[PDB]
């Protein structure tokens, strides 16, 4: 109802670690703690999306005891929970006893249909670090009476294998041959392979072999997998990857039936160019990528579009067309990561493999929702009317988001580097910037929504503050161009200029001094592997990657670069905070519910997961909150941003806001007016009329009715908030 605060739970931050910080959250002003998944995940999981037991609350977080202790402790200071749940899939680990049961007994297992496996004879688990023969030859498979172990993974032995071991009267590695181990493995209901020379014959999360989907569309599977979930004393739920479901609508109807229509439910689901959530999803919105990108585009200055475009082209010496890039990247991922699944979907749907890859690469939204959506939702890419089997399309719909996500989010976003502050999850790189009236129209359609407004998550490519700095370049492209050409002649890098160009922008976004350089180094390596041009996760080009790492060591080692960059960067950083405050105000005061990624209630520069997964120093945040004040804060002081978070969450509790009236450079909701300027490096020339005695809500300094320059109202921060009386 007022604000959500996302916490990344794990062993290093447990239910008890949360309990210690409840007074902080309360005083910050937030109403809901937005908890990461809490069912038992693999031991040591830093994130909890690799579920291994549906019927138990993760002991590494505090177990069932800690959770209810947390909840009751939290409610006792007006804090509610929105609990992240993961319906679609589980992890291949021995701690997943349901899955082990299927591996042991196959058709005799009650969990035979709980898992989305393709074939009825075997399951192929491409999880070996080497060829099976090599693994065996190295003796990396340890035998017991009734189980094998590989790299700490325990898998059971079926009846036939155990009969074999009794025949040869041998139950450890000492009393049998390598070809005996071989024979034993070949007769297991599971067949282990090298992770690169095997297609899984089961449905995954995207292309993650470790994760196998559960068949929640079957009513027994849904009941069992939501047994603990249904008992949770929580105000709300967030649904991970709902687009993976065979029938999301049916799933939401059963979830609503289960936990009642009063709970707040958000879905993780990426919306495209004009899409909205299905009317019949009894759901209160998404986690807010739509909002994020609307603000994100608004922060970008349109007048720099042509110049940034032409320089990018000139600097890499290659023109890049975005629509072809998107298309080729989806086709790249279809063939590289999902060839096995698309081969099967071709046979199921009676089409040629290429036509089907062409169709998936054509889809302009993440997926269609037959049998509820009409068949003409696939009409436009199925130009030849080949796709007709309803259930086949229903089946295909489960893979459609994986092509969009892996092709656009995890490939295109790491290649088209014109201005990477835009390369975000849920973005549309076909557009560049957005207007205030565009922003108003977006809000107008959401005036009564409680959907999340967020600018940073555990999956966003960057934190909001990283994007705010890089977007400043759009306002000063000429100066930007000068710097890059000098840096490029100064350093003489033996690498792809697209990688080099990428790096510079990343430094601009994330600069906190020329130390701690392993973060940017690891990130850039991740970037170019995602890009899939000179290297990949499956086949790292160690020779190229070393050139890239060499370049970055040279950079941090070049006094001329450091001094030049440092001086350019002072401007960026100064203007970036401004954009960040504008965005921040927009997040708390637009229609919808504002979300806070842990630690980002102050300045915080996070790159891509896993960099955005670093520990948050709550002790420090508490000390800042303790010493909070409204004068004379340096813009770059962390208390400046925290001040906004605390005062706008507070605003949310005292002033009614259900109302939205657009202004040329702001908007009104009740007795609240927001005035801002997304452009920050140039003085805004506008007259503004304050009709009535108002209060600067951050400064608590009354402003009297009258005409004003806008530049005087918004001052250094580029945003003001006015309340009446
Ligand atoms: Mg995710």
Coordinates of N, CA, C and O and ligand atoms in Angstrom, one line a residue, residues 49 205 238 240-241 268 289 458-459, ligand 1:
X49 N 16.3 -19.3 -5.9 CA 15.5 -19.7 -7.0 C 15.7 -21.1 -7.5 O 15.1 -21.6 -8.5
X205 N 14.4 -24.1 -16.9 CA 14.3 -22.7 -16.9 C 15.3 -22.2 -17.9 O 16.5 -22.3 -17.7
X238 N 4.7 -12.6 -4.9 CA 5.3 -12.2 -6.2 C 5.6 -13.5 -6.9 O 6.4 -14.4 -6.4
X240 N 7.4 -15.6 -9.6 CA 8.6 -15.7 -10.5 C 8.2 -16.4 -11.8 O 7.5 -17.4 -11.9
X241 N 8.7 -15.8 -12.9 CA 8.5 -16.4 -14.3 C 7.2 -17.0 -14.6 O 7.1 -18.2 -15.0
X268 N 6.1 -11.5 -12.0 CA 7.3 -11.1 -12.8 C 7.0 -11.4 -14.2 O 6.9 -12.6 -14.6
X289 N 8.9 -3.4 -14.5 CA 9.9 -3.1 -15.5 C 9.3 -2.1 -16.5 O 10.0 -1.4 -17.2
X458 N 17.3 -7.2 -8.6 CA 18.3 -8.2 -8.6 C 18.6 -8.8 -9.9 O 19.6 -9.6 -10.1
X459 N 17.8 -8.4 -10.9 CA 18.1 -8.9 -12.3 C 18.4 -7.8 -13.3 O 18.7 -8.1 -14.4
Ligands
LIG1 MG1 14.4 -13.3 -12.9

